[model samples]
Target: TVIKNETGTISISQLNKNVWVHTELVPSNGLVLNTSKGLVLVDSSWDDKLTKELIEMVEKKFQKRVTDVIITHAHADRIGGIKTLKERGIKAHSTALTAELAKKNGYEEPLGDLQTVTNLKFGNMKVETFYPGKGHTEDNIVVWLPQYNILVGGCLVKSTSAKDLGNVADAYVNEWSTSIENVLKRYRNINAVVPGHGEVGDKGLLLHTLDLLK
Candidate 1:
């Protein structure tokens, strides 16, 4: 069955509303917020089929085009559906580091795939991508929405009980914890948290994740 968070899609606080949280199906969960202009998307999940289905689900329910997509990192699970978004004429956004990494990893085109990096602003909502430092990967970035105190930490932040830092093979372990601290400091008011690969939870979730790293 398809999981969904029943909250309305368009509102001042749509970003923070935890619509649905799925586990193994897609490591990175998603949130649907109501934007005055249109629906704003966070990470688009792993598969094009699943991502398209999710987008359709949102549009069918909210009746809005996904005008914007923000990728928290360069990981395939977080950005694999970028091609799908492009086909639908939706603009995608991500950090410069992520764009570079996406090219290096062969998941995105090297020369012009960077077109999606752009400033995003909506009614009472601001979407900005920032890299605290390298942790899970040098491409890791957090999407911070100041108004709703919501943050998409990509694969950088996970549950405290997580068995291991899954991608340490390509991670900068020395800087990962500090990166989490930087995210916490920048958005201290963040009330909601969305990790690239786990259940969305309260802001305190970062602290637990930090503790686990140490």
Candidate 2:
């Protein structure tokens, strides 16, 4: 079901049991998972306004405050809302490299404490952040929801509709394939794969991304 109606380029839909996917006109995407501890946000939208609205909608519907956010990279679509998150006293988690890039990009830095293959638990939900080498960006990382077998591939994994790599400004074209291969081997079964843009797919999305890189 679509939770957002006639909003400004914002759409929130239920992707699975307690997981919701949010998309913006930037076509930027992220995930919201309701856990026993609190709401775990996978990524933020393009700016403070969108992130604020997204948080409100999610909080109202889920009846829980957002406790933490895992930024997939340093891109605006993922870390632009760091200020808003800070204002709300939310924990913005990201790799150290991403934090540095975020600050360099004029955005507030996140926690910058998550290391490679960081594992976090919000009550019953177990979330893992894996840096499968570089692709979309040097600091790009994918979030894994072990309980649901959902991989939030961020901008690292291309959507099926993506004719070619979208933004190569900070991309590692030659290394993208190996990175995708890393993810494929790490997670044996991916039921629903959420790309940073376009429609959600399965493991095939990762496969398509590999092909696009080739």
Candidate 3:
């Protein structure tokens, strides 16, 4: 379903009982996981108002508070709403490098306290993070939801329509393909994949990203 307003358009899909994919016209996307503890957000939308709108949407639909957020990188589109989230008492997680870069870029720090490579468990749901070298950014990471066989590629994987790497300002072009290969080696049986931008697809997104890198 699509939700629209002055901010922008947000497309939401309930992928499963535990997972929801939220896409925005700012041309960004994120994931929402329903857990016993509450909702676990993958990435915040574009800005404070947009993020708050997303929170309201999820809370109204799922009837739960967003207890935590996991940022995939330091990009503004991915971590822009972090300050608003912090004000709401929501815990945000990200790699230490991402946090440092974000702070350096003028954004608030995430829960740098959490281990970057460790798997996180929320009630019965499990989400694992992996730093597959660097493609989109030096600190970019992908989230794997093993229970649902869903991989939140963030900016690490490109959508089918993306002919070239969208943003390489902070990307590691030399290691981009290798980074995706690492993702392939670590996670098999990927039933669905969500890129940072554009429509969701299957494992082919990973392959397509490699092709773009080359």
Candidate 4:
């Protein structure tokens, strides 16, 4: 499945082994979870038109309404289209810290637009968030879908060759690695990773990310 936005197009490729990865030009990749009830979107693109188009594509192929929307972090490009979702009567969700960061950064609920939750079940799928004490920001959160053995690292995990630690603009470097370790410990079955900005890969990316911080 491919989703295009004003800035770039997101190509969701099958990595074989029942895993799918999406690459977005604007930084941030979207993941579609094959749940029993319907499809669950990991993160929506930044703008309204693109987000809507993405949702339309998902709905058409999955033949199911988007049961849930998970914002991996508080960045504008990651959570911007949440407003479009609100208009459609779909509530957007994220971690508590992500909600706070969203507000602190001027994205107030209702006006700024969002739906926050640490964990929740949408139909037959489950969305779980762990703060891990902060990484890219004080409120960074990662999502986990147990059944799919997938972990949405948001902006926390980067590709092996990624040159810069994005969002060090507000990053908590000292605590970042430990936070990732927490994730590694908790979601032991994460066979695939869907990073916020780069290509998706195996669990080694997570370890490599920690090495970068060290």
Off by over 4 Å in 1: 1-26, 109-119
Select the stronger candidate by TM-score from 1 and 3.
Answer: 3
Higher TM-score: candidate 2 or 4? 2
lDDT of each: 0.67, 0.91, 0.87, 0.70
Distance (Å) between predicted and true CA of 210, model 4?
Answer: 1.3
In model 4, the clashing pairs are 28-196, 28-197
Please give, for residues 71-141, the per-residue lDDT of candidate 3 as tens digits: 99999899989989999999999888889999999999997644546799988889898888877999989
TM-score of each: 0.81, 0.97, 0.95, 0.83
lDDT of 4 at 203: 92
Angstrom error of the Cα, residue 110, model 3: value is 0.5
Clashes of each: 7, 0, 0, 2
Clashes of 4: 2
Error of 4 at 182 (Å): 1.1
Score candidate 2 by lDDT.
Answer: 0.91
Model 1 weakest 10-residue run by lDDT: 109-118
